[PDB]
Amino acid sequence: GSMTEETHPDDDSYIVRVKAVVMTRDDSSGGWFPQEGGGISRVGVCKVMHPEGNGRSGFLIHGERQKDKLVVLECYVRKDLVYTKANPTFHHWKVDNRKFGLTFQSPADARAFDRGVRKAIEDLIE
């Protein structure tokens, strides 16, 4: 919780796990550059919530690199998420602070991620 932070190293609350390369566009610095990891990233989605416990839940776009627990992607959201899939093999999102994204490595993780995103936004908004 506030003390002892799970849902990150031990994963635990990971409802979805996909595989892709964590990309990012630092404003316009070159373009979609691999922030970290590069060689595949162990990314996923965990449905978090406020410790108050009122049913209402949030979402955390969290992802380690494909090299054990090293957080290379972290995008916590409370009630706000705007995704945009630019290409069938590249889905991205803007959190005001930069515009992050990832490059799919198979139609499996592609469709799986889009599915998770769709459901996430769905329950997040209504």
Side-chain angles (χ1 to χ4, degrees), residues 25-29 98-99:
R25 176 173 170 121
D26 187 77
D27 184 274
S28 303
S29 176
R98 277 63 175 177
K99 183 173 57 180

Side-chain angles (χ1 to χ4, degrees), residues 72-86:
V72 297
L73 196 289
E74 182 276 289
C75 308
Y76 175 80
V77 302
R78 44 278 153 156
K79 191 180 180 299
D80 52 303
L81 258 177
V82 183
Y83 296 82
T84 304
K85 183 164 57 180

Side-chain angles (χ1 to χ4, degrees), residues 16-17 21 25 27-28 32 36 49 53 64 77 79 97-98 102 105 110 113 119 125:
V16 179
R17 178 72 73 170
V21 181
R25 176 173 170 121
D27 184 274
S28 303
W32 297 104
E36 230 296 84
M49 60 181 59
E64 316 85 83
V77 302
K79 191 180 180 299
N97 177 270
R98 277 63 175 177
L102 43 69
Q105 58 187 91
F113 185 74
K119 292 298 295 76
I125 190 178

Side-chain angles (χ1 to χ4, degrees), residues 44-104:
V45 180
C46 53
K47 191 185 67 177
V48 297
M49 60 181 59
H50 59 137
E52 311 307 285
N54 295 91
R56 172 171 54 249
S57 308
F59 294 93
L60 207 177
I61 309 176
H62 198 257
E64 316 85 83
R65 63 181 300 168
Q66 190 60 31
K67 192 76 284 175
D68 285 86
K69 271 54 183 57
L70 181 61
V71 184
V72 297
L73 196 289
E74 182 276 289
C75 308
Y76 175 80
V77 302
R78 44 278 153 156
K79 191 180 180 299
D80 52 303
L81 258 177
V82 183
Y83 296 82
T84 304
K85 183 164 57 180
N87 290 328
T89 189
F90 197 113
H91 200 138
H92 68 82
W93 56 92
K94 172 175 168 289
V95 297
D96 188 79
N97 177 270
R98 277 63 175 177
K99 183 173 57 180
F100 315 143
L102 43 69
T103 309
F104 298 125

